[PDB]
Design a protein around this nucleic acid. Structure first.
Ligand SMILES: [Zn+2]
Lengths: 645, 214, 107, 159, 81, 96, 97, 214, 91, 49
RNA sequence: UUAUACAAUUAUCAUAUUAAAUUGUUAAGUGCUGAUUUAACCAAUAAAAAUAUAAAUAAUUUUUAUUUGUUUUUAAACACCAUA
């Protein structure tokens, strides 16, 4: 994309030079004219006179005995840049929250600013009904007002549930129909209204309804009247947001291509969105393999484009860059990104730390780096999440170090005292099992985690893998009694025993020559194979051999090993000879994909405080006994205690 | 880690078996769970530990020691308007209706005040007196007329509370220029033990006023 | 067991207790349990608890036999021997240090 | 969610009726739902004559009963399709299937004393009984009835 | 304290136990019911009239009335059971 | 309780006392606001502080924060985040 | 000091009693769940009889069901859900009889 | 009735009494009882029951049906029981169940402060969403106001009882100014913080764990 | 308490917004000439010119009166913007 | 501040101090530092001298 | 000395009377459910912080009733006028 940016910049400079023939910015900024118009409006004499501060008492008169000048004149405030500390108040006589109602602004609708109304009006009717009122009183509704109405409907759509959004989107569609077909008051449907419609489509999904219909209509109408219908940067931002929401990568990349090819300046939001699209494409490729090299270049290219167009980058941009870098497997690059964010003044996010940890999941070393990240979360204002702990334990498991996982647990997770997820327990025990030098403390920690998880329940059901790795750890440590103990827990959960599981128990017996080693218990483990109807294994043969060496000879064990050899030889003769015990994989999923226990749960404290929805609290019914109100002497038992009728 | 218990319900320990209601009673459910949790126990009132047993031998005879089955004892339930106010109101209404038993809430002050009424001879007796939620007062009548003529709280409204001084107690004892053992004023002292004005004046102390009765 | 599962005959607590009584070894009882789970046979929660208690006792007896076996060779009980005497079998679905649990089921 | 519909359709040609019902079923299936059953209910004469989209009263109408499983949102989508359909003169939607009528309004003690699965699992004919259906038919179904009904037509048969 | 519900029972004894004076009638004998109503209202006693024509449990109540009164005569009055 | 920290090296502490009305036998609790002094900027809005009078430090500042009895953990964490110690209120005094 | 220590110890004892009573309740809920399993399991058995109409079989079922009251048929016509025999149609939805 | 409804939502067989007929069977046998007595595959004891103590351990299917119960049925039946067919009420219960899984310290726990704050706020979002589509609902306006106040109380208690959970819940959901003083005129007087003292939360942070109090 | 009217006896809408917007802007009403071309063969049954109305952005099938060609276009493009038959404009 | 809660807060403080003395158990021999000086003497201001 | 306000014809004003209720456009039902009828499908809505002594533990908003505006080829009507 940087090549397109350079070509567009040089062409724009050449056009400027031709115009000068008939500092030469290399691009066009669609926001500048609107910002300048707002500033000029603010500086206009009428605006200043209307929003002049309240009149002083010395400016009104003396001592306020005159009926007309006893108190100041009504002062009109601007909700966007108020010239007063607090716009509202709830004193007894100067209450003003009721006068933010829509009905009071209905009196002045030919002058009204619909976006400001939608933002700062309280008891505001449904967007369709509001549009009906506007058209009923026949105000010359412009494109910005139509966009404001569609934005109101879009806010409602976003607040709605995911599974209750179609009807609100259809209401938006009906409003668009009304605007396009109505003429008796001049109603103008413009580029920003089309952008808001595309954005409603994106919010509710509906790629086919957003792209194919409304983006196509916008393009057709632009081509019809290019001078009177210009696709600005906001339209492309909404289009590319639709692309991101729908998962379409080529369309979003081509949209940013169009923005660059046009000599207008892209915005940081759509730049982050293109970064997210590149990250999606990189993850898609990695899945397919499990030309990416030019994709990596084209992806880092928009990061360089941030500097090309002088756009300041925010926490969202940093998170998108880290996600893209991690999708392209560049842990050093994501570390560079963290350092850049710290050098600049932009807050990091728990999601940024999620990506920071998930990027180093593969590279060896970095054991103390994770500890440093966990330790420095606290000074930075953040607190670790179960997702972050899961990522750290994923690193511990992949690098197969048990000491780091044990330290992480002991020094951070017990203090957090949050519920452990089945994935967290699985990864912890799996790291402690694959660890080269497991210690007994790992038995305590793993069994405590298992019991705690059982005490709170879950809905992922990784019981058999967690107990499999637990038996593997008991095998590597020689805790045969602990293995038998976990055997009853597996029985109680009612899950089938496994050849791998009994192999691990047998290996536990073999390694437990000193810690409760028993040839009769070897016979018991052989009986497990004979009676439970499970195919023995080549690793089963290995483990029975090791146990035989560790304790001695026994007729039952010798018969078992000979039948094992005969059966596996016969199966090899039949075909498919090599069969060992497959490893339980280490779940390696992105932080944005591993299950997160949280929903949208969207609310607005400003609306809660200001009662935008007319929220009503019934008064306590004369429950304000105040000393200035009381009139009467009070003495024990009352003035006339115990009066008979 | 360590989580602290905030409310009295959490501190006293509460299953919260019901879904979300935090203020659900739970007394019965806990009582029957504890009951089936057991028969060396009699239906006499229990005490959680031995040293809590009464000093009087005859009362020790009625009381038994039970480890954790001493809790949740009781049959009746609890039937603004602080417990003393409501106690006085219920007793007055029942006396005017010429009833026998009045189920009235059992708090420290209400229970001590009822005991003082018994001592002075205004109530024939009690039922379920060891309940910590409510207890029944067995009212006494003599020749069709009720022994209690008037009973009213110190806080005639439900709001304002008072603090009687020893001068106030002597005032009550010599009210209206007589020696006054006839109408009984009850006060809860600084030791959380409820006494009448006779004993308060004998001991040179006062307390928070509870009610008057005669 | 498949006949019982298809006929939908519900095994009584007494029948399950007597059945698991006739077993001698922990592995034998485990095989019986997994046969019952493989077939879809019905029973009560009471019978389930009795079955699990039977498995629990089988494990305790097996470990006691192992420690006795070791006792003659070593001439004295081991620290694990005495600690097993006191603790008992480890985590189980019906421990004896918690004798209050099981009263709602058992009658 | 278990939903049921009663459609009153103007009696056009069989091909047109099949096209309408096929479009309805395709909406149901493309909206991620299942149809428990469809039953043509014959052509009857309603007591009140519905006007066609041409505002002509139709004396005769075919009745179709649909039973299906759909989420609420897509159920609403297909519901609007059915209501705005050309042929459908009326579409009665049963909301009372999972929970029997009257307990939401009837008695507070009994509001949470019902089993929704009981009604969810059974078909609409087993929740709303026709005049002909009676527990005798269910007892007959529970009986083998093959060697019981074989002697039914003898006394009349010989005479 | 509870919603109003019209009382119905398949047993004549429930009616006798509930209502002081209860008369069972039909719509085909208006004059007899009018006369009994006249008498009862003249003596100012609360009385409940029940029409058996649309009353559910009609046959149970009718046979019970016939066996208690030893006659088929729908207009019937009951006092103190 | 520390109520405002807009001034440097100064904490505004809201303290309460009791007034007695014999006629109504009432004990009504009033409130008073004090400019306290914390030289190292250690007090955040929402802290329960123990304040002690001393010499005069400024025109209206004759108290100091002897000890913080209960710090505002949420306020400190928000300040770490870079927000305001407590979100500013949306209501206030009328302008007329 | 003694009084405060007794209060703390009483609180801890209450916590232990709560532990025991929770363990006791778990059994009751386990038994109650068992009743649900039996009732719920049986209600699902009867759901196997529901003969859904697969999308592939949809058109065939529609036509076979539309052919229910046509005309000229040997086996008796069924009564509709209202228990009233409706009119017959020769074919293509035209009423004749 | 509210507690009965939510208890039924939480627990499985809480309706069914020991007689195996809940109240609706007694009066309407023809609806509740299964019409056809089928001899098919009467299933055996569920050996997997340990996994689902309460309905919120299985919310990915209709009527909180565990997957182990769906082993043998047909794909059409499974699809009918899938999430997509789930009703709005059961979807809301699944949303509650996610957070119960995240923040419950034991099974059958449904009232812990972290869980309570989340449930009050979920109810508040539900009511506000309803008001979006139907702004003319005065009863819902009143319920929304009450639920917002109670959500504020729950979050305020959570903040001082278990701060880490409060911080996590605030961060996760992009609502940071939820705990916010309404009025400056009263916030100037410590009336926003005096709430903690009056609520008993003023001594509940364990300073040594957040900073050395020397 | 809002009163509704069913447009063409199928679509129930609020009476206010119906009289103001829906009724006067129905395809068979505002542009009957355009309604004539409505492709009644390739176009779903639950959509017909008596309901869809002008301003419908979704494309629909149109049967041309001149060259008898079936083309897909949106109702708003056909009526407001002045859409036409591609084959006719080619000819 | 409501004085009625002083007893409850006293119980809570007692229990918290006991938990602190019981859990961390990390006292030790620490060198005491010179107490320095304080600027907040009571009464009226003092002169330079 | 009222330390008390019986009492109603300046009153001095003013928490909306709620699962039997209110609301429904995108959700139900209806020609406005109340002519018949003490009973009305579905969706939302009934509980859920500490503390009873604790002397502010409450909010500052809402409108189902009636008029009037809004406008109103613009209701067809019906009833009032002769708009509503
Ligand atoms: Zn053409």
């Amino acid at each position: 994309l940087a090549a397109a940016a350079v070509k567009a910049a040089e062409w724009y400079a050449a056009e400027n030079r031709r115009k000068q023939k008939g500092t030469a910015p290399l691009w066009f900024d669609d926001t500048e004219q609107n910002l300048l118009a707002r500033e000029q409006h603010v500086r206009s004499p009428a605006y200043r006179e209307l929003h002049r501060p309240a009149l002083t008492n010395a400016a009104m008169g003396l001592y306020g005995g005159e009926p007309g000048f006893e108190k100041a004149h009504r002062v009109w405030v601007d909700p966007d840049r108020p010239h007063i500390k607090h716009i509202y108040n709830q004193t007894a006589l100067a209450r003003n929250l009721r006068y933010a109602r829509y009905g009071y602004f209905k009196r002045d609708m030919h002058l009204l600013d619909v976006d400001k109304l939608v933002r700062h009006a309280r008891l505001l009717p449904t967007p369709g009904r509001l549009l009906t009122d506007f058209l009923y009183q026949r105000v010359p509704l412009p494109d910005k007002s139509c966009a404001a109405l569609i934005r109101y409907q879009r806010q409602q759509i976003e607040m709605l549930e995911v599974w209750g959004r179609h009807a609100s989107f259809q209401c938006a569609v009906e409003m668009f129909e009304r605007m396009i077909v109505t003429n008796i008051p001049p109603v103008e449907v413009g580029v920003e209204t089309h952008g808001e419609m595309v954005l409603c489509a994106a919010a509710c999904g509906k790629w086919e309804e957003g792209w194919n219909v409304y983006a196509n209509r916008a393009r057709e109408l632009e081509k019809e009247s290019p001078e009177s219908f210009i696709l600005n940067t906001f339209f492309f931002d909404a289009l590319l947001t639709l692309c991101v929401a729908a998962g379409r990568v080529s369309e979003g990349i081509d949209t940013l291509e169009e923005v660059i090819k046009r000599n207008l300046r892209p915005r940081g939001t759509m730049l982050n969105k293109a970064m997210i699209l590149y990250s999606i494409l990189g993850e898609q490729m990695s899945k397919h393999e499990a030309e990416p090299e030019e994709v990596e270049k084209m992806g880092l290219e928009v990061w360089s484009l941030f500097d090309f167009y002088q756009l300041p980058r925010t926490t969202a941009s940093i998170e998108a860059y880290m996600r893209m870098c991690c999708a392209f497997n560049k842990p050093t690059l994501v570390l560079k990104a963290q350092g850049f964010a710290d050098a600049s003044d932009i807050r990091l996010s728990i999601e940024c730390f999620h990506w920071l940890v998930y990027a180093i999941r593969g590279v060896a070393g970095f054991g103390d780096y994770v500890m440093d990240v966990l330790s420095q979360l606290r000074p930075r204002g953040l607190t670790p999440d179960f997702v972050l702990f899961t990522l750290s334990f994923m690193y511990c498991a992949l690098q197969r170090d048990g000491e780091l996982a044990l330290a992480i647990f002991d020094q951070h997770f017990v203090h957090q005292n949050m519920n452990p997820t089945p994935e967290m327990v699985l990864l912890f025990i799996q790291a402690c099992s694959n660890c080269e030098k497991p210690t007994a403390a790992m038995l305590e920690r793993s069994e405590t985690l298992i019991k705690r998880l059982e005490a709170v329940g879950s809905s992922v059901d990784l019981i058999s893998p967690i107990y499999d790795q637990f038996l593997e750890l008991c095998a590597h440590l020689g805790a045969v009694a602990s293995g038998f103990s976990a055997l009853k827990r597996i029985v109680g959960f009612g899950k089938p025993l496994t050849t791998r599981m009994i192999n691990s128990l047998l290996l536990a017996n073999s390694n437990a020559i000193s810690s409760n080693g028993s040839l009769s218990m070897t016979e018991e483990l052989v009986g497990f194979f004979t009676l439970l109807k499970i195919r023995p294994n080549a690793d089963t043969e290995i483990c029975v051999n090791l146990c035989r060496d560790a304790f001695g000879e026994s007729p039952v064990v010798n018969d078992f090993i000979k039948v094992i050899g005969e059966s596996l030889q016969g199966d090899s003769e039949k075909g498919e000879a090599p069969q060992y015990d497959e490893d339980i994989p280490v779940i390696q999923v992105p932080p944005h994909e591993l299950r997160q226990l949280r929903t949208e749960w969207k609310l607005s404290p400003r609306d809660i405080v200001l009662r935008r929805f007319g929220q009503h609290t019934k008064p306590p019914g004369k429950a304000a006994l105040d000393v200035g109100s009381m009139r009467g002497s009070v003495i024990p038992f009352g003035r006339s205690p115990g009066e008979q009728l | 880690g360590h989580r602290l218990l905030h409310g009295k319900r959490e501190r006293e320990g509460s299953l919260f078996a019901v879904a979300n209601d935090v203020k659900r009673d739970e007394r019965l459910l806990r009582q029957q769970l504890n009951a089936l949790l057991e028969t060396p126990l009699v239906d006499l009132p229990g005490v959680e530990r031995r040293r809590d047993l009464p000093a009087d031998p005859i009362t020790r005879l009625f009381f038994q020691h039970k480890g954790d089955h001493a809790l949740y004892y009781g049959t009746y339930d609890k039937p603004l308007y602080t417990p003393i106010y409501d106690f006085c109101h219920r007793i007055r209404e029942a006396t005017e209706q010429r009833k026998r038993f009045v189920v009235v809430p059992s708090t420290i002050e209400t229970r001590g005040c009822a005991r003082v009424m018994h001592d002075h001879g205004l109530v024939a007796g009690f039922r379920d007196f060891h309940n910590d939620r409510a207890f029944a007062v067995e009212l006494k009548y003599f020749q069709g007329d009720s022994t209690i003529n008037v009973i009213e709280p110190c806080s005639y409204d439900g709001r304002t509370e008072f603090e009687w001084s020893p001068k106030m107690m002597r005032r009550l004892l010599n009210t209206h220029g007589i020696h006054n053992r006839l109408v009984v004023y009850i006060c809860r002292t600084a030791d959380n033990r409820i006494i009448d004005h006779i004993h308060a004046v004998k001991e040179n102390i006062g307390g928070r006023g509870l009610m008057m009765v005669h | 067991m498949h006949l019982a599962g298809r006929n939908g005959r519900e095994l009584s607590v007494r029948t399950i207790q007597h059945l698991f009584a006739r077993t001698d070894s922990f592995a034998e009882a485990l095989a019986v349990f997994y046969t019952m789970r493989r077939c879809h046979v019905a029973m009560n929660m009471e019978a389930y608890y009795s079955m699990l208690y039977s498995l629990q006792r089988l494990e305790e007896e097996g470990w006691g036999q192992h420690f006795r076996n070791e006792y003659e060779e070593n001439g004295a009980p081991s620290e694990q021997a005495m600690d097993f005497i006191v603790k008992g079998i480890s985590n189980a679905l019906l421990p004896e240090n918690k004798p209050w649990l099981g009263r709602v089921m058992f009658q | 969610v278990f939903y049921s519909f009663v459609l009153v359709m103007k009696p056009r040609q069989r091909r047109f009726t099949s096209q309408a019902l096929r479009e309805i079923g395709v909406a149901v299936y493309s909206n991620g739902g299942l149809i428990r059953s469809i039953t043509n209910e014959g052509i009857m004469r309603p007591y009140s004559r519905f006007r066609d989209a041409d505002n002509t009263p139709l004396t005769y109408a075919r009745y179709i009963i649909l039973q299906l499983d759909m989420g609420e949102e897509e159920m609403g989508k297909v519901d609007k399709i059915i209501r705005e359909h050309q042929d459908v003169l009326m579409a009665l939607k049963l909301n009372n299937l999972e929970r029997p009528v009257g307990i939401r309004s009837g008695n507070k003690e009994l509001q949470a004393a019902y089993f929704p699965l009981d009604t969810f699992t059974r078909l609409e004919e087993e929740i709303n009984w026709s005049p002909q259906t009676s527990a005798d038919i269910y007892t007959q179904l529970e009986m083998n009835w093959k060697e019981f009904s074989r002697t039914r037509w003898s006394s009349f048969l010989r005479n | 304290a509870t919603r109003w519900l019209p009382f119905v029972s398949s047993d004549l004894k429930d009616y006798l136990n509930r209502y002081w004076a209860v008369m069972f009638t039909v719509g085909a004998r208006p004059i007899e019911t009018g006369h009994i109503r006249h008498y009862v209202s003249w003596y100012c006693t609360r009385m409940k009239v029940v029409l058996l024509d649309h009353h559910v449990y009609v046959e149970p109540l009718r046979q019970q009335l016939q066996e208690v009164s030893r006659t088929p005569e729908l207009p019937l009055l009951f006092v103190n059971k | 309780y520390v109520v405002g920290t807009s001034m440097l090296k100064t904490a505004v502490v809201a303290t309460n006392h009791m007034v007695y009305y014999p006629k109504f036998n009432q004990r009504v609790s009033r409130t008073k606001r004090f400019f306290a002094h914390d030289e190292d900027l250690a007090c955040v809005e929402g802290d329960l502080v123990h304040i002690k009078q001393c010499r005069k430090i400024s025109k209206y500042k004759h108290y100091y924060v002897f000890s913080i009895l209960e710090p505002n953990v949420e306020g400190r964490e928000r300040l770490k985040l870079g927000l305001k110690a407590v979100p500013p209120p949306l209501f206030g005094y009328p302008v007329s | 000091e003694k009084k405060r220590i007794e209060a703390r110890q009483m609180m801890d004892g209450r916590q232990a009693l709560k532990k025991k009573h929770l363990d006791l309740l778990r059994e009751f809920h386990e038994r109650q769940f068992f009743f649900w399993y039996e009732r719920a399991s049986e209600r699902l058995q009867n759901m196997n009889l529901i003969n859904y109409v697969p999308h592939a079989q949809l058109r065939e079922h529609i036509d076979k069901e539309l052919d229910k009251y046509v005309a000229g048929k040997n086996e008796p016509y069924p009564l509709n859900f209202v228990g009233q025999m409706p009119f017959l149609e020769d074919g293509d939805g035209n009423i004749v009889e | 009735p509210v507690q009965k409804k939510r208890q039924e939502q939480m627990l499985y067989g809480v309706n069914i009494p020991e007689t195996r007929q809940m109240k609706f069977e007694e009066q309407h046998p023809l609806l509740a009882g299964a019409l056809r007595k089928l001899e098919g595959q009467p299933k055996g004891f569920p050996f997997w029951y340990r996994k689902y103590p309460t309905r919120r351990h299985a919310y990915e299917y209709r009527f909180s049906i565990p997957v182990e119960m769906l082993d043998g049925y047909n794909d059409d039946v499974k699809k009918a029981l899938s999430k997509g067919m789930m009703s709005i009420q059961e979807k809301q219960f699944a949303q509650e169940a996610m957070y119960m899984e995240r923040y419950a310290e034991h099974d059958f726990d449904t009232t812990s402060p972290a869980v309570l704050a989340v449930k009050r706020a979920l109810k508040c979002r539900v009511l506000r969403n309803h008001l979006l589509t139907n702004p003319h609902n005065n009863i819902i306006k009143t319920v929304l106001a009450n639920t917002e106040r109670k959500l504020n109380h729950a979050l305020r208690r959570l903040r001082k009882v278990d701060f880490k959970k409060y911080w996590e819940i605030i961060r996760d959901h992009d609502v940071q100014d939820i705990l916010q003083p309404p009025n400056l005129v009263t916030y100037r007087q410590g009336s926003y913080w005096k709430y903690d003292w009056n609520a008993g939360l003023a001594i509940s942070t364990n300073l040594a764990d957040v900073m050395d109090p020397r | 308490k809002a009163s509704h009217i069913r447009i063409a006896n199928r679509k129930r809408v609020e009476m206010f917004v119906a009289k103001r917007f829906h009724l006067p802007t129905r395809l068979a009403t505002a542009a009957p000439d355009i309604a004539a071309e409505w492709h009644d063969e390739l176009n779903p049954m639950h959509m017909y010119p008596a309901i869809i109305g002008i301003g419908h952005v979704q494309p629909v099938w149109w049967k041309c009166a001149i060259c008898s060609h079936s083309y897909q276009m949106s109702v708003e493009k056909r009526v407001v913007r002045g859409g036409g038959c591609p084959q006719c404009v080619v000819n | 501040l409501k004085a009625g809660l002083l007893g409850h807060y006293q119980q809570e403080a007692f229990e918290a101090r006991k938990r602190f003395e019981e859990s961390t158990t990390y006292p030790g021999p620490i060198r005491a530092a010179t107490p320095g000086d304080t600027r907040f003497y009571s009464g009226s201001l003092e002169s330079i001298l």
